[PDB]
Amino acid sequence: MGLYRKYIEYPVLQKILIGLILGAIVGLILGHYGYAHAVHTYVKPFGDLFVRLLKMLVMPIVFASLVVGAASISPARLGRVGVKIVVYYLLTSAFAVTLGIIMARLFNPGAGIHLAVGGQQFQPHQAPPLVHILLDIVPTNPFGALANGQVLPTIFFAIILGIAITYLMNSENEKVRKSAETLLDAINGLAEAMYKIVNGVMQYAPIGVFALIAHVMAHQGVHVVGELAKVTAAVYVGLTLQILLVYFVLLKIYGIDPISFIKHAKDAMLTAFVTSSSSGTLPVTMRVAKEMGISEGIYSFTLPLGATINMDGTALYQGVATFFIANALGSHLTVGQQLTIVLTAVLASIGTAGVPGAGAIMLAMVLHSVGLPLTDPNVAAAYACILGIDAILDRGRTMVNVTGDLTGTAIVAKTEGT
């Protein structure tokens, strides 16, 4: 029990990074001496178990999180300040995904990698016309969409259902109000239960990543050190442009001096880089906002909300990650699929999920909507590759997420003062 206990409190992301390094080394050593059949027969089934567990948790989270999230920012309860801050959060998230897509075009990640896990390349599906893509957002049967794997139709039904519940809770009838509260509590309980299961699965992630990487390297000796460096460079350069080309421009437009803003907010960014948690730095963010002179009534509402639904760093990462996987498999993304990435990433941020390791679940949502199933051996291999280096990228993502929260509060405060 002592050895098992020591395995738990070790950070999950660092454990996943360790599994990636040893998996590559073990696969190369075994493959040089043969033993490719042994790795395929025995090591591979452990990796297949991990992806099956990860895919099982996707659909219940999609429905439950969006229903609860949409109820919190429903128009029935949003004030004048709430409306303005919500618009800013959604617009900035939309441009973050687009910026990440552009960076993936300049630096091609995984272009040199050619993945044939089973001996055959990935076969993409046919692209429907653009007009049909827009219409299929509305599901003809909400139960059928849940039974199947339509992510976007499920999101559409969950959002409108959550908004309608909030209007029922303002009704004059006592019975109607009680029925609405009971339904919301049951759906909220389902979301909380899913997060507990996510914590357990992520503890098995280092074992699953080790098996997937070892199987790939044993069969073929692909070089990934250079390619994983390019995806790291694309993410960090994109994060820098997000601050300079968006936050600095918006502050200049609204009259806030960008130089003074950075000096006051430097404490929040450093804490975000070290702790690598948005909720952990919330007390520090509140103190920084008070120093700038923002009224207590404003930042006491915007800052707690921003830590949940405003994530510019995560949105940019999802754009780069999707192109890396598609390039590695040799497929191409059409304009209809690229717009699906932007629409899915922005809408999924509304869902209330703060459990660590939820970034992997979010990436699986985007891949499934585009048309890259996680059960495919080629997709799973590429997915485990970029998941291994998640420890390095996490520090940069958290800093941008916190910085965007402070920028929105300052802009809203200036408008209220006028």
Ligand X SMILES: N[C@H](C(=O)O)[C@H](OCc1ccccc1)C(=O)O
Sites of contact with Na ion (CB under 5 A): 89, 92-93, 278, 306, 310, 312, 401, 405
Q: Which is nearer to ligand X, 85 or 358 (CB)?
A: 358
Partner from Na ion, ligand X, none contacting 150, C-beta within 5 to 8 A by type = none
d(CA 202, CA 198): 6
Q: Quote the least distance from Cβ 323 to Na ion, whole Å.
A: 20
394 makes contact with ligand X (CB under 6 A): yes
232 binds ligand X (CB under 6 A): no
How many angstroms separate the CA atoms of 362 and 399, rounded? 19
Closest to ligand X by CB, 166 or 278: 278
Question: What sign results for the dihedral spanned by CA atoms 168, 171, 174, 176?
Answer: negative
- Supply 316's token pair: 């940019």
Give min distance, CB of 90 to Na ion, in A.
7
The answer to whether residue 358 forms part of the interface with ligand X (CB under 6 A) is yes
Asked if 399 interacts with ligand X (CB under 6 A), we say: no
Place of tokens 């044939």: 116
Q: DSSP assignment of 80-113, as one string?
A: HHHHHHHHHHHHHHHHHHHHHHHHHHHS-TTSS-
Q: How far is the CB of 394 from ligand X (least distance, A)?
A: 5
Indicate the DSSP class of residue 77: T
Q: Which is nearer to Na ion, 124 or 356 (CB)?
A: 356
Q: Which does 394 bind (CB under 5 to 8 A by kind): ligand X, Na ion, none?
A: ligand X
Tokens of 271: 């804490």
The phi and psi torsions of 35 (rounded to 5 degrees) equal 55, 20
Based on the shown chain and the rule CB under 6 A, indicate whether residue 202 belongs to the binding site for ligand X: no
In whole angstroms, give the CA distance from residue 171 to residue 149: 35
Exposure class string for 177-190: b at 16+ Cβ within 10 A, else e: eeebeeebeebbeb
* Binding partner of 314, given ligand X, Na ion, none, CB within 5-8 angstroms per partner class: ligand X
Based on the shown chain and the rule CB under 6 A, indicate whether residue 359 belongs to the binding site for ligand X.
yes
23 binds ligand X, rule: CB under 6 A: no
Instruction: Tell me: does residue 44 bind ligand X (CB under 6 A).
Output: no
Distance of CA 230 to the CA centre of its chain: 20
Give the chain's end-to-end CA distance (angstroms, integer).
Answer: 63
- Decide if residue 278 touches ligand X (CB under 6 A): yes
Which of 116, 305 has the CB closer to Na ion? 305
How many residues touch ligand X under the rule CB under 6 A: the total is 13
For residue 353, the partner it binds in ligand X, Na ion, none, with Cβ less than 5 to 8 A by kind, is ligand X
Q: Strand locations in 55-192, DSSP E?
A: none
Q: How far is CA 358 from CA 27, 200, 350, 352, in A?
A: 29, 12, 14, 11
Least Å distance between CB 401 and ligand X? Answer: 4
Near ligand X by CB under 6 A: residue from 43, 101, 151, 353: 353
Cβ nearer to ligand X, comparing 342 with 362: 362
310 binding partner (options ligand X, Na ion, none; Cβ < 5 to 8 Å by kind): Na ion
Site for ligand X in 302-341 (CB under 6 A): 311, 314
Is residue 62 within 8 A of residue 194, CB to CB? The reply is no
Q: Which is nearer to ligand X, 179 or 277 (CB)?
A: 277
CA dist 294 → 113, 291, 347 (Å) = 50, 8, 29
Distance CA 181, CA 158 (A): 16
**What residue 398 binds from ligand X, Na ion, none (CB within 5 to 8 A, per partner kind)?**
ligand X
Cα 361 to Cα 347: distance, rounded to the nearest angstrom? 14
* Shortest distance, position 310 Cβ to ligand X, whole Å: 9
Candidates 398, 403, 407, 409: give the one binding ligand X (CB under 6 A).
398
Task: Give me the residues that bind ligand X (CB under 6 A), please.
Answer: 276-278, 311, 314, 353, 358-359, 362, 394, 397-398, 401
